[PDB]
Design a protein around this ligand. Structure first.
Ligand SMILES: *C(=O)[C@@H](NC(=O)[C@H](O)c1ccccc1)[C@@H]1NC(C(=O)O)=C(CSc2nnnn2C)CS1
Length: 265
C-alpha cells in the first residue's frame, strides 16, 4: 500500500510529504496530501521561464540584462559570476532552471513585470493554465521563509503537476519554446538525489528542484518509461517540527520517488 509507505517515510524523516502523479490511460492518479499547500521554493522557476518564453518573441532570449551588487541577495551560482558583464535572458532562464539561481529568477520576474516585482504576472500566468490554487507573493530570498501553514508563496502537489503537464506534455507553449523549457529541465544540475535517484537509469527524468527553510525539499519532474510513456511526478516536503533551521532531506524525496517508480514500472 502506497499510503502506508508514504506515512512511514513521514515518521522516518519527521516530515510532511505531498505526492501527486496525474492519471494516464492505464494508471490511476497517485495522491498523498496532494491538495495540501507546500511552499514553491525554487520549483516556481520552471513555470516562470515558461511565462517569459510565452510572453516574448524567441529572440528576446538574446537581450542582455545588467544588474549590480545589491541584486545578489540569494544563492546565485551563475549570476554572481557575471555580475560585471550582465546576462542575456537566455542565460538567465538557463541559470534559473539548471542551477536554481535566485538572482536570475528575480531578474526574470522583473522582466515579466507589473505589480509585486513580477509576482502578480507570474500568478496570472498560472491562472491562465487553470491553476486557481497556487500563488507567488515574494521573490528570493523571502519566498522560502514563510511560516509553516502560511499560504503565501505556496502551491500543492496536485496544482503544480497539472501546470507542469500542460507546459511539457500539453499545448501551453508552442513546440519551439516547449523544447527550450524541456531541454533546460533535462540538463538540470540540482536533482540527482531526488526524483532522479528513485527511477531506474533507463527512464528519462527532467526536473526542477526547490529547497527552503523549515526543512523544505521539493522536486517536480516529467519522466518517460523505457518505451516513451510519460508521467508527471510532484513531490513536496517540509519538516516544521525542526523549526526554521530544520535540515531539508533529499533522501525523503528519493524514497518517495522509488515508491512511485515501483507502481509505474
Ligand atoms: C530555490 O529553492 C532556491 N532555494 C534557496 O535559495 C533556499 O533559500 C535555500 C538555500 C540554502 C539551503 C537551502 C535552501 C535554490 N534552489 C535549490 C534547489 O532547487 O534545490 C537549492 C538546493 S541546494 C543545491 N543545489 N544544487 N545542489 N544543491 C545541494 C538552494 S538555492
Amino acid at each position: 500500500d502506497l499510503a502506508d509507505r508514504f506515512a512511514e517515510l513521514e515518521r522516518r524523516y519527521d516530515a510532511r510529504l505531498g505526492v501527486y502523479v496525474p492519471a494516464t490511460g492505464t494508471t490511476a492518479a497517485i495522491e498523498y496530501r496532494a491538495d495540501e499547500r507546500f511552499a514553491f521554493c525554487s520549483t516556481f522557476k520552471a513555470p516562470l521561464v515558461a511565462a517569459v518564453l510565452h510572453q516574448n518573441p524567441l529572440t528576446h532570449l538574446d537581450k542582455l540584462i545588467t544588474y549590480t551588487s545589491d541584486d545578489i541577495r540569494s544563492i546565485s551560482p551563475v549570476a554572481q559570476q557575471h555580475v560585471q558583464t550582465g546576462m542575456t535572458i537566455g542565460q538567465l532562464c538557463d541559470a534559473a532552471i539548471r542551477y536554481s539561481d535566485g538572482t536570475a529568477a528575480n531578474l526574470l520576474l522583473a522582466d515579466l513585470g507589473g505589480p509585486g516585482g513580477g509576482t502578480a504576472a507570474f500568478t496570472g500566468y498560472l491562472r491562465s493554465l487553470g491553476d486557481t490554487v497556487s500563488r507567488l507573493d515574494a521573490e528570493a530570498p523571502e519566498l522560502n521563509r514563510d511560516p509553516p501553514g502560511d499560504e503565501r508563496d505556496t502551491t500543492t502537489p496536485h496544482a503544480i503537476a497539472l501546470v507542469l503537464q500542460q507546459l511539457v506534455l500539453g499545448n501551453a507553449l508552442p513546440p519551439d519554446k516547449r523544447a527550450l523549457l524541456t531541454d533546460w529541465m533535462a540538463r538540470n544540475t540540482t536533482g540527482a538525489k531526488r526524483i532522479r535517484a528513485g527511477f531506474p537509469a533507463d527512464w528519462k527524468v527532467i526536473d526542477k528542484t526547490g529547497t527552503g527553510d523549515y526543512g523544505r525539499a521539493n522536486d517536480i519532474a516529467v519522466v518517460w518509461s523505457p518505451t516513451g510513456v510519460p508521467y508527471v511526478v510532484a513531490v513536496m516536503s517540509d519538516r516544521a517540527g525542526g523549526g526554521y533551521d530544520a535540515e531539508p532531506r533529499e533522501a525523503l524525496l528519493a524514497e518517495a520517488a522509488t515508491c512511485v517508480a515501483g507502481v509505474l514500472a
